[PDB]
């Protein structure tokens, strides 16, 4: 029996609808589960408003990591600039029944649920442009020298509408985030959104969030993930289908280079040889973003043909922006300040 009956076998707090905490919070319901615990909808008797409360797992490794999230949340929430409002606001936190509880302003549903409500047709390029611009302003706020925060898990489920009928958004879940200059953990980011430097076991910096953003923005407009790998080897092959073999100056410094590639006598790299007969991937660089976005064929799958807001020129700008965000080299990958000056946003 777990934590005197309050917890299940997965270190989660067994949620009971109606339950009341510290004579203050009235638990309405479970919203969802996640690696780190649960999120519930609750009414705050005192402040007279609905909130969302993230209940962290009762397990030392999860609690300790979640204290980092709180520190970062508070450092971001106290900053004196208007860009801070693209990050969810942590109102407060407390321990209860041996679970750290994080109390948040209430938001609306996530970008994934938005995509699914369109049956994966994708949202319009105009909307995509509004999400991209907010995301890049958020990333600029994270890059503020005093913060230097890497989110480390951007993806649609971590971007929420503030309001179900508007286009304002916020970034949630700094559960896996760190600041620059802090022990390198391989195996970060969700696989579809994971940068090549992380797949390659290399050091990483704030640019890994720009990589993920590029992937997310393509998925929001097409309705489906750009790089849909079932495992790391598949993930790297799908990136390669689109962007080519990564450049030698990267692979030469990459501890995991030989998990995916091999080096030729002349110092060039190729994908690792496979069983003769096996053909699984398009050749390196032949799956063009140009075609995935249908720049000149009516947009993704032709579905935007003859709509306003979706011109060849609009697509070429978007495409150019995506490719600058999916630069293999993290030192030349477009940074937030410069992404914001891009003509996609004129
Ligand atoms: C209209 O219908 C609706 N549906 C769903 C809603 C979900 C929320 C909501 O989830 N808010 C939330 C979530 C988080 C978090 O950190 N979410 C993460 C995900 C990470 N993938 C998460 C989700 C579930 C469990 C854990 Cl441990 C973590 C952090 C801060 C907040 Cl304000 C919400 O506010 N309004 C919602 N309205």
Determine which helix (DSSP H) or strand (DSSP E) holds 269, and give its type and residue range. strand 269-271
Whether residues 100 and 112 share a domain: the answer is: no
State how beta strands 269-271 and 178-179 pair. Answer: unpaired
Please indicate, yes or no, whether residues 112 and 200 belong to a single structural domain of this protein: yes
**216 & 257 share domain:** yes
**Spatial contact of 77 and 132, defined as CB atoms under 8 Å apart:** no
39 lines ligand 1 (CB under 6 A): yes
The verdict on 70 and 219 lying in the same domain is no
If asked whether residues 151 and 299 sit together in one domain, one would say yes
Cβ–Cβ under 8 Å, residues 142 and 180 = no
How is residue 18 written in tokens?
A: 């109606």
Same domain, 182 and 198: yes
Q: What is the CATH number of the domain that holds 175?
A: 1.10.510.10
At residue 262, the 3 state secondary structure works out as: strand
Number of folded domains that form the chain: 2
CA distance 66 to 57: 9
Measured from the Cα of 56, ligand 1's closest atom is: 27
Beta-carbon contacts of residue 160 (< 8 Å; ≥ 6 apart): 88, 107, 108, 109, 110, 111, 169, 170, 172
286 CB-contact burial (10 Å; exposed 0-12 / middle 13-18 / buried 19+):
exposed
Alpha helices of 145-275 — where are they, by DSSP H?
196-199, 207-222, 232-243, 248-251, 257-260
Q: Which two tokens stand for residue 46?
A: 């005192």
Q: How far is the CA of 110 from the centre of ligand 1 (A)?
A: 8
Question: Based on the domain organization, do 153 and 34 belong to the same domain?
Answer: no
Exposure string for 226-254, b = 16+ CB within 10 A, e = fewer: bbebeebeebbbbbbbbbebbeeebbeeb
Statement to judge: residues 45 and 124 lie in one domain? no
Instruction: Kindly give the pairing relationship between strand 99-105 and strand 37-44.
Output: unpaired
> Ligand 1: which of 32, 59, 76 to mutate, most ligand atoms within 8 Å of CB?
32
Whether residues 138 and 235 fall in one domain:
yes
- Way the structure was solved: X-ray
Close Cβ partners of 130 (under 8 Å, ≥ 6 residues apart):
167
CA separation for the pair 322, 326 (Å, rounded): 6
Same domain, 156 and 75: no
Give the C-alpha distances (Å, rounded to integers) separating 206 from 10, 81, 150, 261, 334.
Answer: 33, 20, 5, 25, 11
For residues 334 and 326, what is the distance between their CA atoms, to the nearest angstrom? 9
Resolution (A): 2.3
Q: Is the domain of 213 the same as that of 315?
A: yes
State the residue range of the domain holding 25. Answer: 1-80+88-106
Residues 184 and 71 in one domain: no
Q: Is 157 in the pocket of ligand 1 (CB under 6 A)?
A: yes
Which residues make beta-bridge pairs with 39?
A: 32, 54
């Amino acid at each position: 029996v777990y934590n005197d009956g309050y917890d299940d076998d997965n270190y989660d707090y067994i949620v009971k609808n109606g339950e009341k905490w510290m004579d203050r919070y009235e638990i309405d319901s479970l919203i969802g589960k996640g690696s780190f615990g649960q999120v519930v909808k609750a009414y705050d008797r005192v402040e007279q408003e609905w909130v969302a409360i993230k209940i962290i797992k009762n397990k030392k490794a999860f609690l300790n990591q979640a204290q980092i999230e709180v520190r970062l949340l508070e450092l971001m929430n106290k900053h004196d600039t208007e860009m801070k409002y693209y990050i969810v606001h942590l109102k407060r936190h407390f321990m209860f029944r041996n679970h750290l509880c994080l109390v948040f302003e209430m938001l609306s549903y996530n970008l994934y649920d938005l995509l699914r409500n369109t049956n994966f047709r994708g949202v319009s390029l105009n909307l995509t442009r509004k999400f991209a611009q907010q995301m890049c302003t958020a990333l600029l706020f994270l890059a503020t020298p005093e913060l230097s925060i890497i989110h480390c898990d951007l993806k649609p489920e971590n971007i929420l509408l503030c309001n179900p009928k508007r286009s304002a958004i916020k970034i949630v879940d700094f559960g896996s985030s760190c600041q620059l200059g802090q022990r390198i953990y391989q195996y970060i980011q969700s696989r579809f959104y994971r940068s090549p430097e992380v797949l390659l076991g290399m050091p990483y910096d704030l640019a890994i969030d720009m990589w993920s953003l590029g992937c997310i923005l393509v998925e929001m407009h097409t309705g489906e993930p750009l790089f849909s790998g079932a495992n790391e080897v598949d993930q790297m092959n799908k990136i390669v289908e689109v962007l080519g073999i990564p450049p030698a100056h990267i692979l030469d410094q990459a501890p995991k280079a030989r998990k995916f590639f091999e080096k030729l006598p002349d110092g060039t790299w190729n994908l690792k040889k496979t069983k003769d007969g096996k053909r699984e991937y398009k050749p390196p660089g032949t799956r063009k973003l140009h075609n995935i976005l249908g720049v000149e064929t009516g947009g993704p799958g032709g579905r935007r043909a003859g709509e306003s807001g979706h011109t060849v020129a609009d697509y070429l700008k978007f495409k150019d922006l995506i490719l600058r965000m999916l630069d293999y080299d993290p030192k030349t990958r477009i940074q937030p300040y410069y992404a914001l000056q891009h003509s996609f946003f004129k």
